[PDB]
UniProtKB/Swiss-Prot annotation, chains A, B, C, D, E, F, G:
The keyword Iron does not apply. S-nitrosylation inhibits channel currents and ATP release. GO terms for biological process: ATP transport; calcium ion transport; cell-cell signaling; monoatomic anion transmembrane transport; positive regulation of interleukin-1 alpha production; positive regulation of interleukin-1 beta production; positive regulation of macrophage cytokine production; response to ATP. GO terms for cellular component: bleb; endoplasmic reticulum; endoplasmic reticulum membrane; gap junction; plasma membrane; protein-containing complex. Residues 43-78, 173-212 are extracellular. GO terms for molecular function: actin binding; actin filament binding; ATP transmembrane transporter activity; calcium channel activity; gap junction channel activity; leak channel activity; monoatomic anion channel activity; protease binding. Keywords: Calcium, Calcium channel, Calcium transport, Cell membrane, Disulfide bond, Endoplasmic reticulum, Glycoprotein, Ion channel, Ion transport, Membrane, Phosphoprotein, S-nitrosylation, Transmembrane, Transmembrane helix, Transport. It is found in: Cell membrane; Endoplasmic reticulum membrane. Widely expressed, including in cartilage, skin, spleen and brain. Disulfide bonds join 47-199, 65-180. The chain holds residues 2 to 354 of 426 of the full protein. Ion channel involved in a variety of physiological functions such as blood pressure regulation, apoptotic cell clearance and oogenesis. Forms anion-selective channels with relatively low conductance and an order of permeabilities: nitrate>iodide>chlroride>>aspartate=glutamate=gluconate. Can release ATP upon activation through phosphorylation or cleavage at C-terminus. May play a role as a Ca(2+)-leak channel to regulate ER Ca(2+) homeostasis. The modification Phosphotyrosine is found at residue 133. It comes from Mus musculus (Mouse). This is Pannexin-1.
Length: 265, 265, 265, 265, 265, 265, 265
C-alpha cells in the first residue's frame, strides 16, 4: 500500500541534505508510485490481438511488442521511463556521495578541531593558533571547489532532468499508442496475422502526470540549488567552514552561552 | 489484513503533532483501506468486452481504458485519487518537516538553556540573565512567524483538501462509469469492435465513501488548527516559548516541586 | 495462517487497558479472520454471468456489481463491513489515545511525586505537604472529568457497536444476495444481456457469524465498562489518584513492607 | 513450509505453562497445518458445475456454495472449523491471561518479599515476621480461588473441546459432501441450471484427522489439568505460595546451600 | 530458494543435542524440501478429467479426489506424509523439551554448585562437603531415570520412524496412482462422467526418495542413540553428573590449569 | 532478484573456512540461481498435450510426467538435481560442523591457555611449563586425526561432487527430453490419448551450465584442499597447534612487539 | 519497487572500496533492474504458437524454446545474461575478498602498531624503532604484490566485462529473435505442428540498454583502476603503508595537531 511507500520517507549542510533528499527521494517515490502499486493494474502494454488469436498468442503479441518498442523515440522513453528517473535519482545522489567520501572527512576533522579550540577560547575568556589556522583556510579554495562542484553537478543534473521531463511530459500525450508488428522473420509471411497491432503503453498516462510533478518540484528545487552558490551571502574555504560552523552551532557549548550574553548585551 | 494497517498506527507541540499525525496518517490509512486489501477485489476498471472478444482482447480493453481515462475531469480524478490523497498527505507533512528542520533546532537550543537556568533560579531560591534573555525574546517575532506559517500552510492545505473532497464526494456518484473507446489509429476502422465500451471505475465506490470520511475528519480538524492561531489565549516569540515551556513542564524538576508548593500555598 | 494472527495478540488502569485491548483488538482480529485468510476463498462477490459471457465479461459483471452495491442498505453495509468494524476499532482506541495524550502526562507527574513523598513518609516513620496536596486534589474534579469522558465515550461507542452488530446480524441472513444489473448507459440497450444478474456477497456469511461474536463480547464488555463508573466503590480527583495509587502499589517499596506489617499487626 | 510453522514453536507454574502452551499452541499449530500450507491445495469447496457452465459460472457456483453452507449442522461446522479451533485456543489462553493480569502481580510481590526474607533467615542463621506473614497466608483462600478458577475454566474448556472434537471427528466422515443449490431469487427459474450442485468441502478430510489429533492430545491433557487440583498433594493460599516457592527454588541462594547441607546431614 | 532453507540450519549434552538437532531438524528440512519449493510444481494431485470437462470441472475432480483419498492405506499415508514427518519431528523434540523442563533445572543448579565448589577445592589446594554431596548423588537414580527415559523415548520414536519410513518407501513405488471416482450422491447417476478417474499423487515420487534419505540418516542415528545407553562407558546419577561435568570442563577454570599440570606431571 | 542472493553472501583455520564457505556456499548459490528466480520461468516440465486436451488435461500430463520421471537415470538426476547439489552442500558442511563440535572446543581451551602463557613468557622476558605442555602435544596425534579426517572427508566429497558433476554435465545435453506416457491403469486403454507424450525438463539447460560452473570451482578447490594435507609445510598435534597459533597471532600482544623486534634485529 | 532496490544501496582504501562497490554493486543493481521488477513483464520468451495450439501447448512451446536456446551464440548469452553479469560481479568482488582475507589482517596489525608508535613520537616530541621498522618495510615487496594483484585482477576482469558488454551490446540488436522448433524425437513427425516457431527473448531489449550502461560505467571505471597502479604518485611496501597511513590520518590524534602546527608554521 502507498503507506508502505510514504512511511518509508515520512517515518552535509541541512539545506543541501534537504535538496538531495528531495532530488533523490522524489523520483524514487514517483517510480514507486508509477510502475508499482495497484494503480498500474496488471500489464504495461496490451494490443488488439485478433479474436482468432489464442490467449497465449495474444500474450505473445503483447510481450513481443514490449520488445518491439526498441525496433519511435517516445516509445523508447516510455518503456525505459522508470530507469531514466532512477538514473536521475542516482546521478543526483552521486554529488552527495562524492561529498561524503571526498570532502566530508577533511571537513569533519577540521570542524572538530575548530569547535574544540573555540570552546578553549571561551574557557580562556572566562579564565591565536586556531585563528591563524582559520586565517590560513581564508587563503584556500580547495574544499570550496569540491562543494561548488557538488552543487554545480546537482544543478546541471536537475536542469537535465527538467529538460527531459518537460520534453517527456509535452510529448507523452501524443505517443502512448503505437503500431507494433510481430510480422518478422519466417512468420512475416503469415496471412492469418494482421500487418500491424495497435498497442497502448498503458503506464504512460501515469508517467505523464508524474513527470509533471517531478518537473514542478525540480523547477522549485532549481532556485534553492542556485541559492547555494550565493556562498558569501549565506568564495574562500573559510566561508564554507564558517557556514558549516554556523551549522554546527548546535555543538558549540560556548556559543549557547556567548550568544545569550551577546543578545542581552 | 486491516490489522496490519491499524497496528501500524495503533501500535513539535502535542496538539500540533496530533493534528499532523491525523492530517497525514488518516489519508495514508484511507489509501491503504481504499486501493489496497481485499475489499478492492481484483481490478480497478472493467468493461463490456463483447462476447466475441478473447480473454486478452477483453483485458486489452480494460487496460486500454485505464489509460483512456486521460483522453472527463471526474474520471481523471477517479484514476489518480490515491495519489491525490497522498499528495495531500505529503503537503500536510511538509509543515511539520519544515518545523522540524527550520524552527525546532533553534527552539531546542533555547528551551534547553531556559529550562536549565530556571532550575538554577529554583536552586538559588532554595539557596536576571535568563529573564532578560526571555524579555529579549519578548521583543521578537522571528520563530512565531515560522510557527504561524506552519499552522497557516496546514490550515490552507486542509481547506484545499476539504474543498477537493467535498467536490469529489459530491461528483463521485454521477461519474464512476464512462464510455471508453479503443477505436483509435488503425483499428478505429475495425468493424468487429463496438464504437464505445462502457466501463466502471470499480474502486470509485470505495473512494466516494472514504472521501467523505476524510472530509468529515478534516472538517473536525479545521477548528483544531484554527485554535492554534489563538496563541496568546493558549503574538511575540516569548508567547511561543511560554507555550513550549508549558509543554516541557514534564522536564522542569523545579516546577514539579514549585507547582505543588504554589497549589498548597 | 491464523497463528500469524493469534500470535500477534497472544505473543492507563489495568482493567481499562484490558477493556481497550479487547474493544480494539477483537474487531481487528475479527476483520483479519473475516476478509483475510483462506476461509474467505477467492472473491467477495460472484454472479450468474450467462454461459454466453466471456471469462472477462463474467469478471466484469462481478466487479461491476461490487460497485453497483452502492447504487439496498444491507448491501451497503455488507460491502463496507470490514471498514465499519475498523471504524469501531479506531473509535474505541481514541478514548485511550486521548487518555494517553491529555490525562496520563499530568497523572504521571502527580503519581511519581506522590509515590516518592509517601516513601519519604515511611522513611520518616522509621526515622504534611503531600497530604495537603492530596487533600487539595480532594477538592478537584478536573482529571476525573477526563477519565469519565474516556469511559463514557467508550461505553457510548460500545453501545453503538452493539446496536449496529445486533441490527447487522439480524438483517444479514435475509440479504447476502441481491439482483445486480449492469444494464446502464449505452449497454442498457444490449439485448444479449440479462436484465438483472443475481449476485451473492459470499463473505456476508462469515461477517454474520463474526458480528454475533463481536456482539457477544461487547455485550460482555458493557458491564465491565459500566463498572468503571462505580469509581468510589472501586467522585473527586483524589479518588482517581487513589485508584491509580492502588494500581501502582507495585512501585511502593514502603507498602510492600507496611502492608505486611499491617496484615500481621 | 511446515518448518516455518514448527520452528515458530520449537525455536505461572511450569506445568501450567506447559499445559497452556500445549492447550493453546497445538490448535494454532493444527489450524496452520489444516487450512494453510500446500497440503490444502487451491480451494476449500468445489462442485460439479455442468460442462455448459463458464469458468466463472463454475467459480460462481463454488463461491456461492461456500456461502450456501449457512443456508446442515456439520457443514456449518466444517466451514467455520478453523475459527472454532481458534476460539478454543483463545478460550484456553484467557485463563493464563487472567492469571497473568489478576493473580500474578500479587503473587510476584509476595514471592519476592518471601524469598528475600528467607535469605535473611539463612543469613541470620549463619549470624518471625515472614513466618507470621506466611502463617497469615495460611488463613487465606483468596489467591487459590483465582488459581482454582483458572485451572477449572481450563479444564471445562478442554472438556468442551474434547466433546466438540469427538462429535466433529465422529460426524466428519459422513458429511464432507453436500447438495448445494444456486437456484434462488430470480434465477431459481433458470432451466439451464441443475436443481442441485454436489459439492465437497475438500478441507474436511484434513480437519477430520487433525480433530482426532487435537482430541487425543487434549484427552492426554485432561488428567494433567486434573492433577493440578490435587494442590495439597503437589487448600489454603500458603499451599499455593509453597508450590510457587518450590518452583522459585532456582532463586533461593540459601536453599542451594541449605538443601546440600540437609541432603548430606 | 533452497538456500533460504539450508541457511536456516547452516547459519543437554552435546551429542544428545546433535542427535536431537538431526532427529528433529532433518524431517523439518525434508518436508521443506518435499512439499515446498519449486521442485513440487503446481499441484499435489491431478487426474484424467475427460476432454468434455470444463477447466473448473477438471479442477473439481482433482480437488474432490484430494479429499477422496480418505474414502487405500498408502494413499492415506501419501496425502498426510508431510504431517507424519512433522509428527515424528515433534515426537523427537519432546524428549529434549521434557529434558529441558523436567531435568535441566535441577542439573543446572547442581552443576553450578559443583563447579564452584571444585574451583574452591583447587583454590584451597593452592592455599569434604562437595565430595560427600557427590557421594550422595552416587546413591541416587532419580535424574538418570529422566535421562534414560529421554534417550529411550527418542530411540523408540526413531525406530517407529525407521519402521514407518521403511514400510512407506517400500510401498510408495506401487501406489502413487489410484482410481478416484467423483460419482457419489446425486451425480453418481451422471452418464456424462467416467465411472473412475485415474489420479496421480504427484508429490509421492519426491516423498519416496526423501523417506529413504530420512530412513538412512535415522538408521545411522539409531546406533548413536544406542551408544547413549552405555552411560558408565561414556548407572547412578553421579555418573550422569560426571558426564555433564566432563561436558562443562569448558567452565572449570581449575581444570584448565590442573589438566595441564596432570598432563605434564 | 539476484542481488537478494548475492548480497546474502557478499554482505576453523581461515583457508579451511574459505574452502568450506566456497564448498557449501556455491552450490546453495547455484541452486538459488538454478531452480529459483525468473530465469527458470513458470514450469519445470512441459509436454505436447494434444490440441484435444483441456487446459487441465494438459496440466495433468505435465504434472503426471513430473512424477513419471521416476518410472532413465539422467531423468531421475535431472528432477532431483537441486536436492543432489543440496546434499553435496550439507555433506561439505558436516566436516566443518564436526570440526566445530568435536575438535574446536578442545583447541579453543588449549589455544587460550597457550596464548596467555606465551604473553607471560614475554612479560617475564621483560621482567618451562607451557613449553613442556607444548612438547607433550608434540607427542600426540589425537586432534590432528580429527583435522585430517575433516580435510579428507571434504576432499572425498568434493571428488564425489566433481565425479557426479562431470558425469551429469557430460550426459545432460543428451537427455533433457524424454518420452513420458500417462497410459497406465484404467486409462491405458484410452484411444483418445497418444501412446507417449514428449516432455522437456526445461530446467536441465540451466542445470547443465551450472553443473559445469560447480565442477570448475570444485576442480579449483581440490588442490586447495589437497594443500591442507601438507601440514608440516604449512604430523603431530603440535604442528596443528602451531598453525592455529600462527593463525591467532592477531591475538598475541607480545608477538606484535616481538616480531617487530625480531624483524629489526 | 525500484526504491526497494535503490535504497538497498543509497541507504581497503577508500577509492578501491568505491571502485569495488561500483564494480560489484552496479551489475547486481542492473540485474535487479533487468530481469526483476515490473518492466520485465510476465515472461522471458514467447513464440507464435499456432491458433490451433492449446493454452498449455502454447506454454509448452514457450518453455521448450527457453530450453532450446541451448540447442546460436547470442541466444545462449541472451538466456544466461543475468548469471554472466552476476559472474562478473562475483569475479569483481573476489579481489576485495582476497584483499580482506589475505592482506588486510597483516596490514591492520602493522598500521595499528605504526599509528600508536607515531603518537608516541609526538608525545615524546612534546616531552628510532618504528622508523627502523618502517625502513625495513621500505625493503619489502610482499604486501604490495598482493595489492597489485588485487588491482590487476580487478582491471583484467573489468576489461573482460567491457569486452563482453561491448560485444553483447553490439550483437544484441541483431538477435533478440530466433527460429525455435519443438519438432524433436517422436513428435518431430507431427504434421499439425509448424516446422519452426518464431520466438522473441523479450528481456533482451532491456539487457541491451543495461549492457551499454554497464559498459559506460566500467569504461569510466578502467582509468580509476589504472590510476591505482600509479602507487608512488598517489613500488615498495612502505609506499603502500604510507598510502594507508595517509588514509588512516583520521585516527592520528597527533597529526590533527601536527598538521595544524605545520600548516601555520
Amino acid at each position: 500500500a502507498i503507506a508502505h511507500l510514504a512511511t518509508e520517507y515520512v517515518f552535509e549542510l541541512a539545506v543541501d541534505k534537504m535538496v538531495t533528499c528531495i532530488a533523490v527521494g522524489l523520483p524514487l517515490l514517483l517510480i514507486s508510485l508509477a510502475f508499482a502499486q495497484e494503480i498500474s493494474i496488471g500489464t504495461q502494454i496490451s494490443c488488439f490481438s485478433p479474436s482468432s488469436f489464442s490467449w497465449r498468442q495474444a500474450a505473445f503479441v503483447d510481450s513481443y511488442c514490449w520488445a518491439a518498442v526498441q525496433q519511435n523515440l517516445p516509445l523508447w522513453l516510455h518503456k525505459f521511463f522508470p530507469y531514466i528517473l532512477l538514473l536521475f535519482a542516482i546521478l543526483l545522489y552521486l554529488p552527495a556521495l562524492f561529498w561524503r567520501f571526498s570532502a566530508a572527512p577533511h571537513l569533519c576533522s577540521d570542524l572538530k578541531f575548530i569547535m574544540e579550540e573555540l570552546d578553549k577560547v571561551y574557557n580562556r575568556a572566562i579564565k591565536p593558533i586556531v585563528e591563524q589556522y582559520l586565517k590560513t583556510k581564508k587563503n584556500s579554495s580547495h574544499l570550496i571547489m569540491k562543494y561548488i562542484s557538488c552543487r554545480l553537478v546537482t544543478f546541471v543534473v536537475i536542469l537535465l532532468a527538467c529538460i527531459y521531463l518537460s520534453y517527456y511530459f509535452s510529448l507523452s500525450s501524443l505517443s502512448d499508442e503505437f503500431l507494433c508488428s510481430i510480422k518478422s522473420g519466417v512468420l512475416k509471411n503469415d496471412s492469418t496475422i494482421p500487418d500491424r497491432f495497435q498497442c497502448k503503453l498503458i503506464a504512460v498516462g501515469i508517467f505523464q502526470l508524474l513527470s509533471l510533478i517531478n518537473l514542478i518540484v525540480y523547477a522549485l528545487l532549481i532556485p534553492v540549488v542556485v541559492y547555494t552558490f550565493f556562498i558569501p551571502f549565506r568564495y574562500n574555504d573559510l566561508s564554507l567552514y564558517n557556514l558549516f560552523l554556523e551549522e554546527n552551532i548546535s555543538e558549540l557549548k560556548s556559543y549557547k552561552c556567548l550568544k545569550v550574553l551577546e543578545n542581552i548585551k
